Coordinates of C-alpha atoms in Angstrom, one line a residue:
X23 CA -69.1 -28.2 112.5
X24 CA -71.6 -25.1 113.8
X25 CA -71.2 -23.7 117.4
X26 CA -73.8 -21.8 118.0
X27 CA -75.5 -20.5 121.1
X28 CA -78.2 -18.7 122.9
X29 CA -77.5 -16.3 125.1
X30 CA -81.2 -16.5 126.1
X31 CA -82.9 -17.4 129.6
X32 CA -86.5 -17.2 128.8
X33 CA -87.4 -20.6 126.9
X34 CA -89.5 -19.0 124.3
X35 CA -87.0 -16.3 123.8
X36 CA -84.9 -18.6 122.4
X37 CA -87.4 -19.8 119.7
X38 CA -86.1 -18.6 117.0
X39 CA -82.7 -19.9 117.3
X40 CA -84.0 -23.6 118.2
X41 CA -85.6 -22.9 114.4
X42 CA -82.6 -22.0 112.7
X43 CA -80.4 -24.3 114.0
X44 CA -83.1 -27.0 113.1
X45 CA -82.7 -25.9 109.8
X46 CA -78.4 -26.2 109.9
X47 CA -79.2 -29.6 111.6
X48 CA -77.3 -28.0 114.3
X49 CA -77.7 -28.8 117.8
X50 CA -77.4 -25.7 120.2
X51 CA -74.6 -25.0 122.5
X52 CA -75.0 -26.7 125.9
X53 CA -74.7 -24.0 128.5
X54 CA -76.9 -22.4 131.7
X55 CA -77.6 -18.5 131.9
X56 CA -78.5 -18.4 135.5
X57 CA -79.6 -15.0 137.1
X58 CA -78.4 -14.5 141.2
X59 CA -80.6 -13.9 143.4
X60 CA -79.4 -10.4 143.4
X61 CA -80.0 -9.7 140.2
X62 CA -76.6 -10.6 138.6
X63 CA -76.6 -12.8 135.6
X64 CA -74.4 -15.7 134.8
X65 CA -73.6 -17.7 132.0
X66 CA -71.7 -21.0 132.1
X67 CA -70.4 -22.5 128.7
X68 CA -70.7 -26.6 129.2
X69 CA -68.1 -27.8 126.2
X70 CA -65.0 -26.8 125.0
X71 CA -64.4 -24.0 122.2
X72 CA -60.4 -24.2 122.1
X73 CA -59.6 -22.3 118.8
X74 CA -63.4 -22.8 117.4
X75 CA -66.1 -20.0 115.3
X76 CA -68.9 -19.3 117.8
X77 CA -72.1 -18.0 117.0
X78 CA -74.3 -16.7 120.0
X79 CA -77.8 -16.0 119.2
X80 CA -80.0 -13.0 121.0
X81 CA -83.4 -11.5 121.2
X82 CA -84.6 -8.8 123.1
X83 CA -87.7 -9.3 125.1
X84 CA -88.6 -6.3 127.1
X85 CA -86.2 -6.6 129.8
X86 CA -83.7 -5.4 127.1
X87 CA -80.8 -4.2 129.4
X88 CA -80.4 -7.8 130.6
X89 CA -80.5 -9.4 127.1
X90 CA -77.2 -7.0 126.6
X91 CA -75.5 -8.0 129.4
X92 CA -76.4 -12.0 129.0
X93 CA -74.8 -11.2 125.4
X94 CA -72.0 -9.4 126.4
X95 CA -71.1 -12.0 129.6
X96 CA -71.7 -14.7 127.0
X97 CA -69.4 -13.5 124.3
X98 CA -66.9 -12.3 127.3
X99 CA -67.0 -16.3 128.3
X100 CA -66.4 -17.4 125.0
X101 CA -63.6 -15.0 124.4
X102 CA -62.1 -16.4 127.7
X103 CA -63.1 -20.1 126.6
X104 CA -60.4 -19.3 123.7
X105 CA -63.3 -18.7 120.9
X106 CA -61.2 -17.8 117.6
X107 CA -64.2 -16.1 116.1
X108 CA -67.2 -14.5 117.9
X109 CA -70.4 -14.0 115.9
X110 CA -73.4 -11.7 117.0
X111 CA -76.4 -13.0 115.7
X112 CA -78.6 -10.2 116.8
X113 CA -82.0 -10.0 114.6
X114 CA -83.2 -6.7 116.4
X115 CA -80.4 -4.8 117.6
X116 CA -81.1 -3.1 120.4
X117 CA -81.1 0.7 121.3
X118 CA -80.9 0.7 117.4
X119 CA -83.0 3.9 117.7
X120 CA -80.9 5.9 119.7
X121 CA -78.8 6.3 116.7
X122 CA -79.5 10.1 116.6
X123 CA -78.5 12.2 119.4
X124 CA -82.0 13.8 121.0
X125 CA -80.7 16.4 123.0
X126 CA -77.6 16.3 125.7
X127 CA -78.2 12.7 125.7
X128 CA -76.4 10.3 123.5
X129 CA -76.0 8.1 120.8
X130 CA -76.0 4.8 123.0
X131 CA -75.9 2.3 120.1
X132 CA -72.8 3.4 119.8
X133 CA -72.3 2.8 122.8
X134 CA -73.0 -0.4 122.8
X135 CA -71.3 -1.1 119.6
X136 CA -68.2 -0.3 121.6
X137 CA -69.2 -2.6 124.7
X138 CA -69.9 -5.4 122.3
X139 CA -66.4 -5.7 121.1
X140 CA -64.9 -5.2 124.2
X141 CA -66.8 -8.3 125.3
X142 CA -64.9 -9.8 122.1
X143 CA -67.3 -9.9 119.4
X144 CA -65.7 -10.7 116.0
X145 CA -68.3 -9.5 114.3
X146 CA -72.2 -9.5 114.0
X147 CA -75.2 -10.6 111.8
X148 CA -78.3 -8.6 112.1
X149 CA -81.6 -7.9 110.2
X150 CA -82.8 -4.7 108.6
X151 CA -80.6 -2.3 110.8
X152 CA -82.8 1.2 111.8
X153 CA -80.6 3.0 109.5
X154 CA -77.8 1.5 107.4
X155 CA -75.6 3.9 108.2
X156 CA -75.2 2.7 111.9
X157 CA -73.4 -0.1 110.5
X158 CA -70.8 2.4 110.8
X159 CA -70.6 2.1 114.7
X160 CA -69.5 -1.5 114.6
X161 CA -65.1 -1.4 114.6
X162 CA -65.9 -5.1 113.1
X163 CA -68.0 -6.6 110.4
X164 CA -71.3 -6.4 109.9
X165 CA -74.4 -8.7 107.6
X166 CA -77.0 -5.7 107.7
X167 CA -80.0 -8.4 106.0
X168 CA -83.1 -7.8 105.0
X169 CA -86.3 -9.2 105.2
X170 CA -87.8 -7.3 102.1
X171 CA -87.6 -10.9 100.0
X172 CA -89.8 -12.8 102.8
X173 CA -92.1 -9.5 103.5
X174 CA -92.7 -8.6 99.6
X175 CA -93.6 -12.5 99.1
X176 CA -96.1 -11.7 101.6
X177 CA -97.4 -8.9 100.5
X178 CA -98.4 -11.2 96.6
X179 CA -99.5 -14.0 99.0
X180 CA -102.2 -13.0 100.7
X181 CA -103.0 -9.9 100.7
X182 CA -105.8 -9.7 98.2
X183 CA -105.6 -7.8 94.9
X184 CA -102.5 -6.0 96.1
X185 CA -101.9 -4.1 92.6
X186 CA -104.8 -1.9 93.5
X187 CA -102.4 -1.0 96.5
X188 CA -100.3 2.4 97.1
X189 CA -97.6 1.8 99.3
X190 CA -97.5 4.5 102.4
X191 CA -94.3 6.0 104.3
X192 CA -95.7 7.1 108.6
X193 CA -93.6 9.8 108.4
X194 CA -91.0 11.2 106.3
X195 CA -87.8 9.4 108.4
X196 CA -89.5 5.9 106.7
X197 CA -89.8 7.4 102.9
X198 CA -87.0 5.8 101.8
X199 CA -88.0 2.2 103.3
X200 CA -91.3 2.5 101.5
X201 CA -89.4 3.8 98.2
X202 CA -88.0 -0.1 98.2
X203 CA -91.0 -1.4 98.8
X204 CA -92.9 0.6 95.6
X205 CA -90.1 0.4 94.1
X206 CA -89.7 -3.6 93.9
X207 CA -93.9 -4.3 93.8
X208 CA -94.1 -1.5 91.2
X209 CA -96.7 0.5 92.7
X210 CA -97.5 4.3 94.0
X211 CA -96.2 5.8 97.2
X212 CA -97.3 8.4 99.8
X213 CA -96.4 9.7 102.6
X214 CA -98.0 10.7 105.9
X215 CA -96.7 13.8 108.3
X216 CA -99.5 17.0 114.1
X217 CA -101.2 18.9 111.7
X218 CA -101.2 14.9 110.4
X219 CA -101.9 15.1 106.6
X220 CA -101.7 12.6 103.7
X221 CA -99.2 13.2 100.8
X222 CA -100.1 11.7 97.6
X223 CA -103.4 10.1 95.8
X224 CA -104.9 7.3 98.9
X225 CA -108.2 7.1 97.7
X226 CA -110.0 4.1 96.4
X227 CA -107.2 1.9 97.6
X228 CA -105.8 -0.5 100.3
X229 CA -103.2 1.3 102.1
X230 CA -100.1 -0.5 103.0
X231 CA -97.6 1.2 105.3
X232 CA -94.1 0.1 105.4
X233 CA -91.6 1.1 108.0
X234 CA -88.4 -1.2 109.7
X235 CA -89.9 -1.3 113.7
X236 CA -93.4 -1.0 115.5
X237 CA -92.5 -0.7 119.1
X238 CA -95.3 2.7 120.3
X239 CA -98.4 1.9 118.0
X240 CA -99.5 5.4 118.8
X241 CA -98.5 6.9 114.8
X242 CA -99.0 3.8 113.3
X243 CA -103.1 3.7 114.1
X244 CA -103.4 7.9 113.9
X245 CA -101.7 7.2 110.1
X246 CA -104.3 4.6 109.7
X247 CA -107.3 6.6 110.6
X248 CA -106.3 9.7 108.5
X249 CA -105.7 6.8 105.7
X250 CA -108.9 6.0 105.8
X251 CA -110.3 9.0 105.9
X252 CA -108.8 9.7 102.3
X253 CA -110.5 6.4 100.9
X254 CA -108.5 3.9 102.0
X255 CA -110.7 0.7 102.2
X256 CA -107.6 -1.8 104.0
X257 CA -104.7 -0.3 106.3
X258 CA -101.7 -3.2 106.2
X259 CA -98.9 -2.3 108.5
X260 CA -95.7 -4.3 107.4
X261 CA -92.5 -4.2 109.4
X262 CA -89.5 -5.7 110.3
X263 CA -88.9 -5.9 114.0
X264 CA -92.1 -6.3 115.8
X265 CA -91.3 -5.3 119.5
X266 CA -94.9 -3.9 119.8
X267 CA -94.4 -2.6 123.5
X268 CA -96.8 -1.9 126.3
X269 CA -100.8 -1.5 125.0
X270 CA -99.7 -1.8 121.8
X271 CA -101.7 -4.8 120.7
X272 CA -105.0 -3.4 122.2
X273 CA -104.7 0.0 120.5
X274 CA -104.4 -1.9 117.1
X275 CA -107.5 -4.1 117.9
X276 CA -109.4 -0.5 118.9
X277 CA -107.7 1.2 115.9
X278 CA -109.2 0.9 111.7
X279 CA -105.3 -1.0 111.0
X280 CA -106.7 -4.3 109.0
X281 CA -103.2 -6.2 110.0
X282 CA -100.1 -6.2 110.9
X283 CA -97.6 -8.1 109.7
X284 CA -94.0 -8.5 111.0
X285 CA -91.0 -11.1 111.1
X286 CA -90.2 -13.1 114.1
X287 CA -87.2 -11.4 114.3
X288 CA -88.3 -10.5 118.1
X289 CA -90.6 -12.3 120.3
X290 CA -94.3 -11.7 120.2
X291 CA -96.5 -15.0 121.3
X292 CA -98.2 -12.9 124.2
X293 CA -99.2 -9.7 122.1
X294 CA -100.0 -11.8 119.2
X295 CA -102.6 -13.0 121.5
X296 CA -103.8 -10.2 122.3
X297 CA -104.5 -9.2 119.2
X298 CA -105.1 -11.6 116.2
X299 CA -104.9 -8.6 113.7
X300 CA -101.1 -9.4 113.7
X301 CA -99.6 -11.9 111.4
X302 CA -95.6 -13.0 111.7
X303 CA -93.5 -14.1 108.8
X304 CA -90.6 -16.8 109.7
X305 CA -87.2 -15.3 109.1
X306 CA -85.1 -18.0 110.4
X307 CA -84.7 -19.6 107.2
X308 CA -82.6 -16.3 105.9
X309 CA -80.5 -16.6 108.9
X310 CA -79.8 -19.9 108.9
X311 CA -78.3 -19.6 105.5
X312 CA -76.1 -16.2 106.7
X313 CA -74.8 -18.3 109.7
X314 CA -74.1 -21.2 107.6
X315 CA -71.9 -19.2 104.7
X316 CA -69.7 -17.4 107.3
X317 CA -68.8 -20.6 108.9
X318 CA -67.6 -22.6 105.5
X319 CA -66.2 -19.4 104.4
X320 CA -68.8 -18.9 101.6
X321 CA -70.1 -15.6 99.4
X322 CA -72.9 -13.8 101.0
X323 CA -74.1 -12.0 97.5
X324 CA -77.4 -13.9 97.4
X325 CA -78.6 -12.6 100.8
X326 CA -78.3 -9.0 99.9
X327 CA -77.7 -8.9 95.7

């Protein structure tokens, strides 16, 4: 009655899936991830999963190419450990935005995708995937959630007067995430794209941009400005996975951006810190309940219908 795991090291990396398995009552999987001295990671399951559904539960913080590998051993030792059913729950997938090929490079979530069920995956659960199509990479299947439900509550919570709002898109690429989001709240939309130009009316109204990830700041605060300087009186920057890496919490204090809010779908205490301009929005309560229909075999309609 729920196995589920962390395949985390880093003791407020695994945060969020203490929180969700407080919420399924759950108790987490006893078992060490070590790291050798030379680098090497290790993972040691400490009970037995004979013929059992295994959820292992991953975020990426910075130091994402060992996160990957700490999955991968982890579901590779489970698989071994005679798991009947492997489940990903991976909130940010990572290297989700090499999904495009750049130039001779390559489309490494794929990659990864592959990696993932060689390490026997039987399938994963993820949130608000870079581009629903790469739920196409995975050979098993996917829970592609969203955190639109908890992030639109948000927005009629507490940011004030939001009606007087106009929902913005950074660049074309995030139109279509912003469509969802005017759409739903039924509100205006524009969209930003440099010779950096506005698309639609701004003026004499609080901007909100929408977009999936904030990793590199750098468009986020030059949309922000230019949204200003069409007569936009508050800048909100709503996104899923708030990875936020490097400087990016002191550009957003130096930058005209009101707030940021994101989910804890990755880890943020530190650059939260840094700058107080960035709410989070709890997620775990979504994923508990995807984890906890899976396992009793239940319909997951409610989570995306």
């Amino acid at each position: 009655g729920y196995r589920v795991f962390s395949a985390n090291s880093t003791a407020a990396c695994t945060e969020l899936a203490k929180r969700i398995t407080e919420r399924l009552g759950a108790e987490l999987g006893k078992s060490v991830v070590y790291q050798e001295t030379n680098g090497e990671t290790r993972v040691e399951i400490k009970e037995s999963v004979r013929g059992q559904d295994i959820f292992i539960i991953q975020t990426i913080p910075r130091d994402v190419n060992t996160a990957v590998m700490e999955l991968l051993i982890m579901a590779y030792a489970l698989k071994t450990a005679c798991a009947r059913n492997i489940i990903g729950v991976i909130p940010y997938f990572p290297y989700s935005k090499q999904s495009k090929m750049r130039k001779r490079g390559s489309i490494v979530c794929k990659l990864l995708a592959s990696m993932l069920a060689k390490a026997g995956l039987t399938h994963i659960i993820t949130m608000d995937l870079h581009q629903k199509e790469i739920q196409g990479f995975f050979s098993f299947p996917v829970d592609n959630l969203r955190a639109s439900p908890f992030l639109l509550q948000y927005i009629q919570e507490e940011i004030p007067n939001y009606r007087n709002a106009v929902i913005v898109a950074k660049s074309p690429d995030a139109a279509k995430r912003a469509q969802s989001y005017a759409e739903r709240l039924r509100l205006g939309l524009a969209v930003i794209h440099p010779p950096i130009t506005v698309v639609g009316d701004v003026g004499g109204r609080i901007a909100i941009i929408v977009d999936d990830i904030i990793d590199d700041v750098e468009s986020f605060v030059a949309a922000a400005e230019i949204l200003k300087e069409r007569g936009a009186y508050k800048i909100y920057v709503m996104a899923t996975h708030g990875i936020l890496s490097a400087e990016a919490p002191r550009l957003i204090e130096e930058s005209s951006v009101d707030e940021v809010v994101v989910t804890n779908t990755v880890p943020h205490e530190v650059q939260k810190l840094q700058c107080p301009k960035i709410k989070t929005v709890d997620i775990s309560l979504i994923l508990s309940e995807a984890i906890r229909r899976i396992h009793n075999g239940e319909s997951m309609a409610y989570l995306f219908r």
